Structure formats: structure tokens, C-alpha cells
Amino acid sequence: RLPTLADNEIEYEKQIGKGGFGLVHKGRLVKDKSVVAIKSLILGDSEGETEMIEKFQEFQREVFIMSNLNHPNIVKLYGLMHNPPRMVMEFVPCGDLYHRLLDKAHPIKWSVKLRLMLDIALGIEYMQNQNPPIVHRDLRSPNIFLQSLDENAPVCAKVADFGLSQQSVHSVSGLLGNFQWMAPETIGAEEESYTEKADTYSFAMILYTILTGEGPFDEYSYGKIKFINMIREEGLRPTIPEDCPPRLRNVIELCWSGDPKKRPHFSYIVKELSEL
Numbered sequence: 160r161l162p163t164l165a166d167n168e169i170e171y172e173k174q175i176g177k178g179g180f181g182l183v184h185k186g187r188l189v190k191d192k193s194v195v196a197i198k199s200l201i202l203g204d205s206e207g208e209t210e211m212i213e214k215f216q217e218f219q220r221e222v223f224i225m226s227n228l229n230h231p232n233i234v235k236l237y238g239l240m241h242n243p244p245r246m247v248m249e250f251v252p253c254g255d256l257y258h259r260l261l262d263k264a265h266p267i268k269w270s271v272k273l274r275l276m277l278d279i280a281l282g283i284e285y286m287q288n289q290n291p292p293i294v295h296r297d298l299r300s301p302n303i304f305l306q307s308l309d310e311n312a313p314v315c316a317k318v319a320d321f322g323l324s325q326q327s328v329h330s331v332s333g334l335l336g337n338f339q340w341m342a343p344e345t346i347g348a349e350e351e352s353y354t355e356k357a358d359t360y361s362f363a364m365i366l367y368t369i370l371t372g373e374g375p376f377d378e379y380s381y382g383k384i385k386f387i388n389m390i391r392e393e394g395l396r397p398t399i400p401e402d403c404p405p406r407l408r409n410v411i412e413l414c415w416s417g418d419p420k421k422r423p424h425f426s427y428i429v430k431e432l433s434e435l
């Protein structure tokens with residue numbers, strides 16, 4: 160159940176569009192003056208082959224997944240527009256976590272790093288409590304949008320970009336490609352099954368990057384086959400700094416366990432992060 164918005168329920172402000180299947184624009188809800196980011200579907204007759212034009216399949220999935228999600232730490236879907244098909248999302252004003260962590264001259268202060276860790280944990284906790292659980296499959300720092308970096312803000316971080324997401328009463332499967340964020344059972348083949356526990360591993364890498372300001376596995380360099388084999392068969396993981404608080408170190412280490420069953424439920428993750 161998602162609301163339909165006309166053309167004159169929203170007024171555009173400007174474009175901003177680094178988007179997977181069309182443009183992104185900033186605008187406003189005429190009713191609220193709620194600020195809003197509008198993602199359009201554009202097939203584009205010329206460039207793409209028939210196979211690539213879906214990609215209508217991705218836009219559709221993102222709508223269907225988002226339609227049931229309502230939580231403060233998940234980017235909210237306000238409505239749908241037609242001609243062209245568009246998702247109207249809440250506008251999140253402070254960019255994304257990946258680009259913020261690149262600013263090394265201005266490191267994020269510790270209390271704000273814990274706010275970010277907990278906000279993202281609460282959003283994934285909510286996903287994993289859905290029936291059936293939502294599997295995002297693309298959790299990484301560019302897909303964490305920052306609402307505010309004030310440590311007393313109601314909401315600092317939100318989970319975004321559910322285009323690859325699954326919610327099935329069956330086994331989930333599919334090879335995943337950004338490998339330094341993805342669980343080992345997802346990077347070997349199309350062939351093997353896995354669950355929401357693959358997102359719990361990605362969340363470990365998000366804890367790592369917030370802790371250190373550095374990209375997961377950037378301390379290693381290997382050819383692609385050897386890198387995958389090391390992560391899958393030799394337990395290769397990023398090095399957690401010696402000064403990491405021990406409760407955070409344990410949460411990260413359990414969350415990136417090679418055995419998906421050993422990665423904790425989010426009620427345990429949330430409790431431990433709240434005690435830091």
C-alpha cells in the first residue's frame with residue numbers, strides 16, 4: 160500500500176542524480192513542504208539491450224520492499240508517481256557515510272560514531288524482525304545516509320538503497336560482487352543459499368569502517384580469486400585496532416564469523432552496542 164502522487168503534489172527544486180535506473184531530484188511535498196528526493200525510471204531506448212532494460216525489475220522490487228517498511232532508521236518511501244514511474248523518498252540532508260568518512264581532517268567524534276553504530280543496528284534489527292526477514296544484500300557505507308551528525312539528534316543515520324533486497328519464505332541465493340563488504344557464502348557462487356545472516360556480516364564491516372574511518376580490507380592487496388579464497392577458506396578479515404573497546408571488538412568478530420549461525424541476533428548486537 161503506497162500512496163500515489165500527481166505532478167502538482169510535488170514541485171521540483173533541482174537535479175542531483177547519480178542513479179542506477181534514472182535521475183534523482185530534490186523537491187518538496189506541496190502539502191507539508193517536506194523535502195523529498197525523487198528517483199525516476201528511464202529505460203532510454205538507445206543505449207541498453209533488452210536484458211538490461213530490466214532494471215525495471217529492480218525498480219519494482221525496491222517499491223515492493225519499501226512499501227512495508229516504516230522505521231526511523233530506514234529511508235521512508237512517501238509515494239509513487241507515474242509518467243515517468245518515480246519513487247518519492249524522504250530527503251536525507253547530510254550525504255552518506257562513505258563520503259563523510261573520507262574527510263580525514265575532521266574525524267567523527269566517538270559519541271557520534273556510537274550513535275551511527277546503534278542507529279544502523281536498529282534499522283537492520285527491524286528488517287530482521289519482519290516476517291519473513293528482509294535481506295538487504297547491499298549493506299555498505301555508500302548506502303547509509305546521514306540525517307545529522309549531532310550526537311543529540313533524534314536520528315543520525317538511515318539505511319537506504321534496497322534495490323537488491325530479498326524477503327522470501329524460501330532459501331535466498333545469488334552471487335554478490337563488491338566482495339569486501341559481502342559475506343563469504345555470497346561471494347563463492349550463484350550456487351549457494353544464505354539468509355539475513357549475510358547482512359549481519361556486512362554490518363560487521365560497517366562497524367569496522369565507522370570505528371577506523373578506513374575501507375574494510377584496504378590493508379590487503381590480492382588478485383580477485385585469491386582475495387575471495389582468503390576471505391572464504393582462510394578466515395581473512397580486516398585487523399581490528401588494539402585500542403578497540405573489548406565489547407565492540409567481540410560484536411564485530413562475532414558478526415563476521417565465517418559460519419553464519421554464529422553471527423548474533425540483532426537484539427544481542429543492540430544491547431551490546433548500547434553498553435559502549
Ligand SMILES: Nc1ncnc2c1ncn2[C@@H]1O[C@H](COP(=O)(O)OP(=O)(O)CP(=O)(O)O)[C@@H](O)[C@H]1O
Pocket residue numbers: 175176177178179183196234248249250251252301302304320
Ligand atoms: N533519499 C535521498 N536523500 C538525499 N540524497 C539522495 C537520496 N537518494 C539519492 N540521493 C542522492 O542522489 C545520488 C544518487 O543516489 P542513488 O540512490 O542512485 O545511489 P547509487 O545508485 O549511486 C548507489 P552506488 O553508486 O554505490 O551503487 C546520491 O549520491 C545522493 O546524493
